[PDB]
Structure 1
Amino acid sequence: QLILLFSRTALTEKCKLEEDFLYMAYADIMAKSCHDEEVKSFEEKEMEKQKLLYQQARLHDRGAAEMVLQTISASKGETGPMVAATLKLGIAILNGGNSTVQQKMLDYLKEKKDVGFFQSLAGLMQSCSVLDLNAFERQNKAEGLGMVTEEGSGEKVLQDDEFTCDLFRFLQLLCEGHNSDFQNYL
């Protein structure tokens, strides 16, 4: 029911994807429950993978593999706290190159003929931040003038590190395992 509500709010036509405390709260429980993170033995490594598959199957069997594609297609290329939380759940359910989730994510896209998803992916990567010399110099002068750095860590150069990393880790996970059916679809 929770996933269906979150997949219906995404399918509802709105001009902008509106901030939703419930969705950023339950996109970090669903994602964090699917990893639960010296040399492990073979049985330990194979048990950490079968538990991973069951924890991932707890969600994509309930429609969570189409929800992370509906919340991205409703973003329309705008970066925010809501796409940086949807891109962490897709990664969580795709970790290890989950073939079932990969097939589910491609079947939905091929069935709905969703053009919004690939237009939002292009807009989210064109809006990703890079290194800035002007901001770094303007911050270096700020520290040089002795004023207290009230802000945390000067996250104006490379404004978003984790969103940019996750947006490409998701695209890598979507093609991991040499998925020749989605490599040719991207």
Structure 2
Amino acid sequence: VVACFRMAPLYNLPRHRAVNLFLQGYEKSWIETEEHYFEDKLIEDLAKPGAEPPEEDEGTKRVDPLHQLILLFSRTALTEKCKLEEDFLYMAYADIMAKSCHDEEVKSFEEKEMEKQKLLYQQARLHDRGAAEMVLQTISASKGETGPMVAATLKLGIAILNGGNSTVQQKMLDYLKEKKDVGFFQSLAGLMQSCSVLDLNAFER
């Protein structure tokens, strides 16, 4: 009975306060829930070579925009820094690339082979341009610090490694062997110690 007077409904609130509250509520309830799927088309248009042989280049095959983006990210990872600074561009485009790969009642064998071929082609579009080395370089530069950088890099690695991709596994193993990178395994270990578990104190509090 006294609750409605201890705290008033929306009609008692001033116009501007209610307007701000409605803006926040509309944002949270609608804008995130509205979802559009553009990753496949984006990563395919970026993969398309834009008529390079028609263009008056008279030279070797120029690198596609997706390859240039992957090279930019790889160079940023390889650059020596005291800390792996967060890059909004990376956390956006790595998510886009991972979505493009994983792209997700009984299925026939021909159909299942079809989704396998689709996944292989989508993983090829990325690990034919250096994504396998990129996802290792970012983890190595992380130096065992948990963050959104690793949270997106691991997702991209899983997306490109779905189904146990032998070509991608071989590419990562060869890259690690030829670079003799200890930082990758050091960062993996550090992430393992930084991983969290259940906390009775926090649960009780």
For the criterion TM > 0.5, the same-fold answer is yes
Give the superposition deviation at 1:73: 0.2
Unpaired runs of at least 5, structure 1: 139-186
For 1:8, the aligned partner's letter is R
2:197 to 111, 130, 154: 130
Deviations 1:92-117 (A, max 9, x none): 00000000000000000000000000
The separation in 1 between residues aligned to 2:71 and 2:94, in whole angstroms, is 13
The separation in 1 between residues aligned to 2:157 and 2:102, in whole angstroms, is 12
1:110 to 162, 172, 177: 177
Tell me the equivalent position of 2:121.
54
Aligned residue runs from structure 1 range 12-91, under 5 A = 12-91=79-158
Number of residues of Structure 1 aligned to a counterpart in Structure 2: 138
For 1:15, the aligned partner's letter is C
The SS at the match of 2:97 is: coil
Deviations 1:20-65 (A, max 9, x none): 0000000100000001111100011000000000000000000000
The SS at the match of 1:22 is: helix
The separation in 2 between residues aligned to 1:37 and 1:75, in whole angstroms, is 28
The separation in 2 between residues aligned to 1:34 and 1:9, in whole angstroms, is 23
The SS at the match of 1:18 is: coil
What's the TM-score, normalizing by structure 1? 0.74
The separation in 2 between residues aligned to 1:22 and 1:79, in whole angstroms, is 18
Higher helix share: 2
The SS at the match of 1:74 is: helix
1:8 to 75, 91, 94: 75
Tell me the equivalent position of 2:57.
none
CA RMSD of aligned residues (A): 0.3
The higher radius of gyration belongs to: 2
Tell me the equivalent position of 2:13.
none
- Point out which structure has higher relative CO (alpha carbons under 8 A, 6+ apart): 1
What's the TM-score, normalizing by structure 2? 0.67
The separation in 2 between residues aligned to 1:123 and 1:109, in whole angstroms, is 18
The separation in 1 between residues aligned to 2:135 and 2:160, in whole angstroms, is 10
Deviations 1:124-174 (A, max 9, x none): 000000000000000xxxxxxxxxxxxxxxxxxxxxxxxxxxxxxxxxxxx
Q: How many percent of aligned residue pairs carry the same amino acid?
A: 100
The separation in 2 between residues aligned to 1:71 and 1:107, in whole angstroms, is 17
The separation in 1 between residues aligned to 2:154 and 2:144, in whole angstroms, is 13
Aligned residue runs from structure 1 range 117-156, under 5 A = 117-138=184-205
Unpaired runs of at least 5, structure 2: 1-67
